[PDB]
Design a protein around this ligand. Structure first.
Ligand code: E9B
Ligand code: MN
Ligand code: MN
Ligand code: ZN
Ligand code: ZN
Ligand code: ZN
Length: 149
């Protein structure tokens, strides 16, 4: 939010703003993964990761979307975990009686650091699904060589 402040996440998509369909995939046997995005302005990025989990790769993809976007961004994720953990970090901003998540604290903090630098962010969850659209596109990119699609 404007100034280095809480500001809640947006209730609906930011009209006009670029949309990042994010995704991560990891294989538990090897802890290898990929995180990345595709956008409706034709951008795309995929990064490979090691020592990672499916939850970490989903957060990493959101981090990449925030690093690579302007002041207003729509992010569509299929990780309800990623949505929930970020959302309550914001909803419970500061406040004693809030207590820190035990896992992925480092990388959620990095996401919070990015989020604070934005004007407006909309984060939405969709179920993973089949088709030709954005979530399916990025799903294929990060799943290649990580898990059977
Ligand atoms: O990454 C995954 S499996 C993975 N990794 N973290 C999670 C889930 C976190 C979570 C939290 C609450 C409810 C459900 C899930 O699930 C994808 C499967 C299909 C994908 N796809 O079409 O993109 S992504
Ligand atoms: Mn996913
Ligand atoms: Mn996927
Ligand atoms: Zn390693
Ligand atoms: Zn603006
Ligand atoms: Zn940092």
């Amino acid at each position: 939010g404007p100034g280095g402040s809480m500001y809640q996440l947006e209730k609906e998509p930011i009209v006009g703003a670029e949309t990042f369909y994010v995704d991560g995939a990891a294989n538990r046997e090897t802890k290898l993964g990929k995180a990345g995005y595709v956008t409706n302005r034709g951008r795309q990025k995929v990064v490979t990761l090691t020592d990672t989990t499916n939850q970490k790769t989903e957060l990493q993809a959101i981090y990449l979307a925030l690093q690579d976007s302007g002041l207003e961004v729509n992010i569509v994720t299929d990780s309800q975990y990623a949505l929930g953990i970020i959302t309550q970090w914001i909803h419970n901003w500061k406040k004693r009686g809030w207590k820190t998540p035990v896992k992925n604290v480092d990388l959620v903090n990095q996401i919070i650091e990015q989020l604070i630098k934005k004007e407006k962010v909309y984060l939405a969850w969709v179920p993973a699904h089949k088709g030709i659209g954005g979530n399916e596109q990025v799903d294929k990119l990060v799943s290649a060589g990580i898990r059977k699609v």
